[PDB]
Write an enzyme that holds these catalytic residues in place. Structure first.
Site, PDB file in Angstrom:
ATOM      1  N   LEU A   9      -2.174  13.708  20.336  1.00 28.09           N
ATOM      2  CA  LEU A   9      -2.955  13.167  21.342  1.00 28.09           C
ATOM      3  C   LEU A   9      -3.037  11.549  21.240  1.00 28.09           C
ATOM      4  CD1 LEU A   9      -5.884  15.814  21.487  1.00 28.09           C
ATOM      5  CD2 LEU A   9      -3.982  15.710  22.752  1.00 28.09           C
ATOM      6  N   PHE A  16       0.929  -1.257  -0.041  1.00 29.91           N
ATOM      7  CA  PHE A  16       0.149  -0.084   0.103  1.00 29.91           C
ATOM      8  C   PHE A  16       0.843   1.089  -0.123  1.00 29.91           C
ATOM      9  CE2 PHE A  16      -1.909   3.499   2.605  1.00 29.91           C
ATOM     10  CZ  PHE A  16      -3.052   4.012   1.667  1.00 29.91           C
ATOM     11  N   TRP A  17       1.750   1.330   0.982  1.00 28.82           N
ATOM     12  CA  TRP A  17       2.467   2.510   1.006  1.00 28.82           C
ATOM     13  C   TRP A  17       3.484   2.893  -0.239  1.00 28.82           C
ATOM     14  CZ3 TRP A  17       1.089   6.609   3.658  1.00 28.82           C
ATOM     15  CH2 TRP A  17       0.121   6.378   4.750  1.00 28.82           C
ATOM     16  N   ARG A  20      -6.404  -6.254   4.667  1.00 29.83           N
ATOM     17  CA  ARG A  20      -6.268  -4.848   3.976  1.00 29.83           C
ATOM     18  C   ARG A  20      -7.377  -3.707   4.125  1.00 29.83           C
ATOM     19  NH1 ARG A  20      -1.106  -5.433   3.297  1.00 29.83           N
ATOM     20  NH2 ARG A  20      -0.915  -3.605   1.944  1.00 29.83           N
ATOM     21  N   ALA A  42      -7.319  -1.394   6.465  1.00 37.71           N
ATOM     22  CA  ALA A  42      -6.648  -0.164   7.067  1.00 37.71           C
ATOM     23  C   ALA A  42      -6.211   0.859   5.594  1.00 37.71           C
ATOM     24  CB  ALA A  42      -5.426  -0.275   7.922  1.00 37.71           C
TER      25      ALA A  42
HETATM   26  C1  LIG Z   1      -4.636  14.685   2.583  1.00 39.52           C
HETATM   27  C2  LIG Z   1      -5.363  13.906   3.645  1.00 39.52           C
HETATM   28  C3  LIG Z   1      -4.402  12.412   3.913  1.00 39.52           C
HETATM   29  C4  LIG Z   1      -4.980  11.784   5.061  1.00 39.52           C
HETATM   30  C5  LIG Z   1      -4.285  10.269   5.228  1.00 39.52           C
HETATM   31  C6  LIG Z   1      -3.084  10.591   5.683  1.00 39.52           C
HETATM   32  C7  LIG Z   1      -2.207   9.124   6.138  1.00 39.52           C
HETATM   33  C8  LIG Z   1      -2.724   8.443   7.416  1.00 39.52           C
HETATM   34  C9  LIG Z   1      -1.952   7.089   7.568  1.00 39.52           C
HETATM   35  C10 LIG Z   1      -2.455   6.518   8.873  1.00 39.52           C
HETATM   36  C11 LIG Z   1      -2.070   7.188  10.054  1.00 39.52           C
HETATM   37  C12 LIG Z   1      -2.491   6.540  11.291  1.00 39.52           C
HETATM   38  C13 LIG Z   1      -1.980   7.265  12.780  1.00 39.52           C
HETATM   39  C14 LIG Z   1      -2.233   6.284  13.755  1.00 39.52           C
HETATM   40  O1  LIG Z   1      -3.550   6.103  14.212  1.00 39.52           O
HETATM   41  S1  LIG Z   1      -1.164   5.234  14.650  1.00 39.52           S
HETATM   42  C15 LIG Z   1      -2.297   4.275  15.643  1.00 39.52           C
HETATM   43  C16 LIG Z   1      -2.669   2.925  14.515  1.00 39.52           C
HETATM   44  N1  LIG Z   1      -3.589   2.029  15.453  1.00 39.52           N
HETATM   45  C17 LIG Z   1      -3.210   0.884  15.971  1.00 39.52           C
HETATM   46  O2  LIG Z   1      -2.062   0.516  16.090  1.00 39.52           O
HETATM   47  C18 LIG Z   1      -4.521   0.180  16.778  1.00 39.52           C
HETATM   48  C19 LIG Z   1      -4.376  -1.322  16.610  1.00 39.52           C
HETATM   49  N2  LIG Z   1      -3.950  -1.831  15.438  1.00 39.52           N
HETATM   50  C20 LIG Z   1      -5.067  -1.970  14.260  1.00 39.52           C
HETATM   51  O3  LIG Z   1      -6.113  -1.436  14.536  1.00 39.52           O
HETATM   52  C21 LIG Z   1      -4.616  -2.292  13.065  1.00 39.52           C
HETATM   53  O4  LIG Z   1      -3.438  -3.325  13.369  1.00 39.52           O
HETATM   54  C22 LIG Z   1      -4.096  -1.301  11.974  1.00 39.52           C
HETATM   55  C23 LIG Z   1      -5.506  -0.491  11.556  1.00 39.52           C
HETATM   56  C24 LIG Z   1      -3.106  -0.368  12.534  1.00 39.52           C
HETATM   57  C25 LIG Z   1      -3.540  -2.033  10.830  1.00 39.52           C
HETATM   58  O5  LIG Z   1      -4.639  -2.741  10.340  1.00 39.52           O
HETATM   59  P1  LIG Z   1      -4.275  -4.359   9.931  1.00 39.52           P
HETATM   60  O6  LIG Z   1      -3.038  -4.638  10.919  1.00 39.52           O
HETATM   61  O7  LIG Z   1      -5.404  -5.102   9.747  1.00 39.52           O
HETATM   62  O8  LIG Z   1      -3.332  -4.404   8.517  1.00 39.52           O
HETATM   63  P2  LIG Z   1      -4.131  -4.184   6.871  1.00 39.52           P
HETATM   64  O9  LIG Z   1      -3.929  -5.606   6.458  1.00 39.52           O
HETATM   65  O10 LIG Z   1      -5.615  -3.815   7.261  1.00 39.52           O
HETATM   66  O11 LIG Z   1      -3.308  -3.073   6.321  1.00 39.52           O
HETATM   67  C26 LIG Z   1      -1.915  -3.319   6.153  1.00 39.52           C
HETATM   68  C27 LIG Z   1      -1.014  -1.993   5.684  1.00 39.52           C
HETATM   69  O12 LIG Z   1      -1.211  -0.923   6.857  1.00 39.52           O
HETATM   70  C28 LIG Z   1      -0.023  -0.546   7.007  1.00 39.52           C
HETATM   71  N3  LIG Z   1      -0.195  -0.146   8.348  1.00 39.52           N
HETATM   72  C29 LIG Z   1       0.009  -0.818   9.552  1.00 39.52           C
HETATM   73  N4  LIG Z   1       0.084   0.175  10.568  1.00 39.52           N
HETATM   74  C30 LIG Z   1      -0.243   1.335  10.251  1.00 39.52           C
HETATM   75  C31 LIG Z   1      -0.218   2.323  10.990  1.00 39.52           C
HETATM   76  N5  LIG Z   1      -0.109   2.798  12.147  1.00 39.52           N
HETATM   77  N6  LIG Z   1      -0.400   3.820  10.007  1.00 39.52           N
HETATM   78  C32 LIG Z   1      -0.613   3.530   8.893  1.00 39.52           C
HETATM   79  N7  LIG Z   1      -0.461   2.200   8.090  1.00 39.52           N
HETATM   80  C33 LIG Z   1      -0.146   1.437   8.781  1.00 39.52           C
HETATM   81  C34 LIG Z   1       0.828  -1.782   6.739  1.00 39.52           C
HETATM   82  O13 LIG Z   1       2.312  -1.014   6.899  1.00 39.52           O
HETATM   83  C35 LIG Z   1       0.386  -2.197   5.465  1.00 39.52           C
HETATM   84  O14 LIG Z   1       0.524  -1.691   4.725  1.00 39.52           O
HETATM   85  P3  LIG Z   1       1.869  -1.997   3.416  1.00 39.52           P
HETATM   86  O15 LIG Z   1       3.012  -2.002   4.608  1.00 39.52           O
HETATM   87  O16 LIG Z   1       1.478  -3.314   3.053  1.00 39.52           O
HETATM   88  O17 LIG Z   1       2.036  -0.862   2.611  1.00 39.52           O
HETATM   89  C1  LIG Z   2       0.766   3.037  28.564  1.00 35.64           C
HETATM   90  O1  LIG Z   2       0.269   2.025  27.956  1.00 35.64           O
HETATM   91  C2  LIG Z   2       0.387   1.942  26.508  1.00 35.64           C
HETATM   92  C3  LIG Z   2      -0.599   1.288  25.805  1.00 35.64           C
HETATM   93  C4  LIG Z   2      -0.446   1.240  24.355  1.00 35.64           C
HETATM   94  C5  LIG Z   2       0.781   1.375  23.851  1.00 35.64           C
HETATM   95  C6  LIG Z   2       1.675   1.891  24.644  1.00 35.64           C
HETATM   96  C7  LIG Z   2       3.031   2.155  23.884  1.00 35.64           C
HETATM   97  C8  LIG Z   2       3.072   3.660  23.354  1.00 35.64           C
HETATM   98  N1  LIG Z   2       2.366   3.601  21.948  1.00 35.64           N
HETATM   99  N2  LIG Z   2       3.145   4.677  23.832  1.00 35.64           N
HETATM  100  C9  LIG Z   2       2.944   6.011  23.395  1.00 35.64           C
HETATM  101  O2  LIG Z   2       2.389   6.106  22.056  1.00 35.64           O
HETATM  102  C10 LIG Z   2       3.419   7.413  23.794  1.00 35.64           C
HETATM  103  C11 LIG Z   2       4.511   7.102  24.686  1.00 35.64           C
HETATM  104  C12 LIG Z   2       5.102   8.439  25.355  1.00 35.64           C
HETATM  105  C13 LIG Z   2       4.563   9.357  25.431  1.00 35.64           C
HETATM  106  C14 LIG Z   2       3.226   9.606  24.459  1.00 35.64           C
HETATM  107  C15 LIG Z   2       2.661   8.446  23.777  1.00 35.64           C
HETATM  108  O3  LIG Z   2       1.796   8.644  23.064  1.00 35.64           O
HETATM  109  C16 LIG Z   2       0.664   9.587  22.708  1.00 35.64           C
HETATM  110  C17 LIG Z   2      -0.698   9.045  22.829  1.00 35.64           C
HETATM  111  C18 LIG Z   2      -0.761   8.096  21.485  1.00 35.64           C
HETATM  112  N3  LIG Z   2      -0.463   9.089  20.616  1.00 35.64           N
HETATM  113  C19 LIG Z   2       0.875   9.521  20.597  1.00 35.64           C
HETATM  114  C20 LIG Z   2       1.052  10.268  21.746  1.00 35.64           C
HETATM  115  C21 LIG Z   2       1.688   2.044  26.051  1.00 35.64           C
END
Ligand SMILES: CCCCCCCCCCCCCC(=O)SCCNC(=O)CCNC(=O)[C@H](O)C(C)(C)COP(=O)(O)OP(=O)(O)OC[C@H]1O[C@@H](n2cnc3c(N)ncnc32)[C@H](O)[C@@H]1OP(=O)(O)O
Ligand SMILES: COc1cccc(CC(=N)NC(=O)c2ccccc2OC2CCNCC2)c1
Length: 411
Positions: A411, A4-5, A169, A171
């Site tokens: 946040l 994707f990316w 896929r 996300a």
């Molecule tokens: C101009 C306006 C533009 C607006 C959009 C700007 C872009 C915003 C981009 C998003 C900013 C988000 C900021 C935040 O919220 S970061 C917090 C992200 N959320 C989580 O970690 C919560 C728990 N995890 C999940 O819910 C899932 O595992 C997620 C949804 C993360 C992936 O779902 P899943 O695990 O079911 O996988 P898939 O099979 O659907 O998809 C796989 C593809 O996804 C790529 N992937 C994995 N993790 C991330 C990630 N954190 N950012 C971007 N992409 C990510 C991965 O490299 C692969 O692509 P490629 O490697 O094959 O290429």
């Molecule tokens: C404390 O319990 C948890 C739960 C889940 C994951 C993690 C690891 C972590 N992802 N930490 C931060 O993103 C983070 C670390 C330090 C300062 C700020 C942090 O996160 C913020 C809130 C999440 N969005 C980005 C800022 C810790």
């Protein structure tokens, strides 16, 4: 490597990013007229849903999705548990666009399955200072300064796919649909952070933690007792001594922020943030929204010492579910937010942040090494953590910068 990316307008390798000198778009320009009117295709048993984030039951639906399916640490010991009041605050700032809150739900029973949120932010994201110094040596100052005007862009957060729908896929579809809706409002850049490495960060900052309740943090395995504390007869007593704090703040004139402080807080905050290469620009209404105290969500204190406000700090709260330990339900974490110091040293200002957070029953204070956060790490007993927060732009070429050149708090 990135199915994707590799299709997106982002630098694809660290080597590509190392070559970037000036800020600017990645894509040649597009128009709103070019963007599809219709939502991005999804399986016909799913539907797109724009939640009303001013409606308690829609907030509750998102709250539950994230409670059970949002970010965990790698060892699945903790999971963020953003509260409903926090989500309302985070997702509805001044002039927010409801259409930028994007959900997928099952058509038959309206079960929420996936979410992503964008909010508007005004960001300075022009060429960094050092690259402008070199550009001016070479007669290229104009090109280097071309995108200096603060830009109205999208900040993305809260991307979440239900655990039962992972690795399907979904996300990328979420991301494409959010991109479409943002593009339809004539915005073409986004800023986001993640704890994972994607193509390609412009900055990366280590996590830092400050224990406030070390007995609990050790019990739930957030923290350990280090080896050196083993040469004490009572390791835990010495850990509690290392981290103990006053109950009362030390700075004369410290008090909670109130609405009449907004103009002065805006002034000192903007004077400070303006010194960083990447930073937000806030109106009065945005200062009010993001800094006035809200119970259980955001905590903001000013120093008004027989003089107009000269200093302030803020922190926000995210509890995490302690999913790996039955003895506690929640880890109550404070996160350093914005601050500005004009009359006292920053370490003296943030010591009161820790004192207030501890007095309010927080277990740990967290931050990333953005802003001037490194300047008080050692004295205030912050420790480096096990991860990094990576900062990214969508459709914006940007040189690699240090995290101390970043003034945007996520946040
Ligand atoms: C101009 C306006 C533009 C607006 C959009 C700007 C872009 C915003 C981009 C998003 C900013 C988000 C900021 C935040 O919220 S970061 C917090 C992200 N959320 C989580 O970690 C919560 C728990 N995890 C999940 O819910 C899932 O595992 C997620 C949804 C993360 C992936 O779902 P899943 O695990 O079911 O996988 P898939 O099979 O659907 O998809 C796989 C593809 O996804 C790529 N992937 C994995 N993790 C991330 C990630 N954190 N950012 C971007 N992409 C990510 C991965 O490299 C692969 O692509 P490629 O490697 O094959 O290429
Ligand atoms: C404390 O319990 C948890 C739960 C889940 C994951 C993690 C690891 C972590 N992802 N930490 C931060 O993103 C983070 C670390 C330090 C300062 C700020 C942090 O996160 C913020 C809130 C999440 N969005 C980005 C800022 C810790």
């Amino acid at each position: 490597a990135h199915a994707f990316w590799s299709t997106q307008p982002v630098p694809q390798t660290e080597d590509e990013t190392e070559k970037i000198v000036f800020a600017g778009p990645m894509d040649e320009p597009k128009t709103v007229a070019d963007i599809p009117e219709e939502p991005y295709p999804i399986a016909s048993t799913f539907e797109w849903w724009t939640p009303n984030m001013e409606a308690a039951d829609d907030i509750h639906a998102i709250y539950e999705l994230l409670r059970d399916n949002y970010v965990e640490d790698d060892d699945s010991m903790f999971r963020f548990n953003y509260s409903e009041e926090f989500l309302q605050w985070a997702l509805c700032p001044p002039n927010y666009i409801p259409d930028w809150h994007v959900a997928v739900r099952r058509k038959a029973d309206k079960k929420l399955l996936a979410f992503i949120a964008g909010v508007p932010v005004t960001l300075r994201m022009g060429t960094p200072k050092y690259m402008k110094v070199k550009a001016q040596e070479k007669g290229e100052g104009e090109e280097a300064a071309k995108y200096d005007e603060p830009r109205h862009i999208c900040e993305i957060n809260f991307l979440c796919v239900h655990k039962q729908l992972r690795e399907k896929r979904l996300a990328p579809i979420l991301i494409k649909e959010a991109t479409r809706r943002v593009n339809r409002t004539n915005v073409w850049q986004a800023v986001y952070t993640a704890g994972v490495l994607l193509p390609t960060p412009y900055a990366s900052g280590q996590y830092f933690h400050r224990s406030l309740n070390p007995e609990k943090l050790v019990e739930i395995r957030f923290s350990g007792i280090p080896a050196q504390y083993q040469k004490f007869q009572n390791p835990m007593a010495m850990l509690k001594r290392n981290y103990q704090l006053p109950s009362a703040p030390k700075n004369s004139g410290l008090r909670e922020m109130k609405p009449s402080d907004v103009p002065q807080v805006r002034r000192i905050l903007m004077n400070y943030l303006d010194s960083f290469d990447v930073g937000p620009v806030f109106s009065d209404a945005e200062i009010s929204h993001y800094l006035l105290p809200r119970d259980g969500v955001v905590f903001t204190y000013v120093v008004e010492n027989d003089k107009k406000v000269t200093d302030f700090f803020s922190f926000y709260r995210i509890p995490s579910t302690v999913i790996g330990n039955s003895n506690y339900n929640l880890l109550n974490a404070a996160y350093v937010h914005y601050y500005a110091a004009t009359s006292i040293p920053l370490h003296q200002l943030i010591l009161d942040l820790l004192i207030v957070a501890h007095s309010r029953g927080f277990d740990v204070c967290n931050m990333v090494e953005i802003l001037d956060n490194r300047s008080f790490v050692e004295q205030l007993k912050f420790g480096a953590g096990d991860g990094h927060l990576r900062y990214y732009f969508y459709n914006w070429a940007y040189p690699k910068i240090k995290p101390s050149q970043v003034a945007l708090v996520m946040l």
